[PDB]
Amino acid sequence: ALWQFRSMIKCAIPGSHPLMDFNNYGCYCGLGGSGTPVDELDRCCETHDNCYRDAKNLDSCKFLVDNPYTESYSYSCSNTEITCNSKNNACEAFICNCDRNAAICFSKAPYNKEHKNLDTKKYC
Amino acid sequence: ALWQFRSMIKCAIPGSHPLMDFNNYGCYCGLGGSGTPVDELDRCCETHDNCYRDAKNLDSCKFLVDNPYTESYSYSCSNTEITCNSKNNACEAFICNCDRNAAICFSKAPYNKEHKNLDTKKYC
């Protein structure tokens, strides 16, 4: 669920304020998105939207309010490393992996502060 | 989900092997159930079935394979005390409370070993 993703982020990058650092970044970090991502980081968010979009399309998955962010799964953090629990059901595991691949990805992308709070109507 | 319930049980009663102690007990501990529970313990399990039956009937909840046992929620154990996380969604929170009320209930019921492995075709 959203709060678990925020803290996976805090797991893979210990110095971070997830909301402050990665919400309203680029074209895809923050609600919906448009155009083409502006850097690797943004690209990470676009992939994440896509991943969620995919998960909505496993016809076996019916998320509360149609939002995969409402879905809690099980995971743990140990020394910067994220592990999704295998006992997550198929839908939970999909979401869990989306979030995981995205905290890892964020952790590897260069952070460009020009790109936080982007003029999207114009650059996206 | 099932594994989380087993370990809530292990939370509220530290000496226990959940499967060995409370599966195949009475009329209601262990798959489905019939007749009238045989003691407070069994009654605890019947309530739990009912609770799950209720949760299946919140028309907003669509469990994987129709089984609320597949649904992971978030919780923690601290000194015998169980806490369901408020950030569980409405469906997750319902299940979480079913499991919680049942580990607590088991923890308070007298354990009658005559009743483990009951002849159900006959006493249930």
Ligand SMILES: CCCCCCCCCCCCCCCC(=O)O
């Ligand atoms: C990757 C975006 C930021 C990461 C951590 C804080 C924001 C969460 C993820 C972005 C999704 C949009 C925010 C969710 C709020 C909502 O439920 O609409």
Ligand SMILES: CCCCCCCCCCCCCCCC(=O)O
């Ligand atoms: C209260 C029953 C026992 C508690 C701990 C071990 C058994 C779990 C709960 C009983 C439900 C039946 C077992 C679930 C197995 C299944 O998925 O069919």
Ligand SMILES: [Ca+2]
């Ligand atoms: Ca987005």
Ligand SMILES: [Ca+2]
């Ligand atoms: Ca869940």
Ligand SMILES: [Ca+2]
């Ligand atoms: Ca039962």
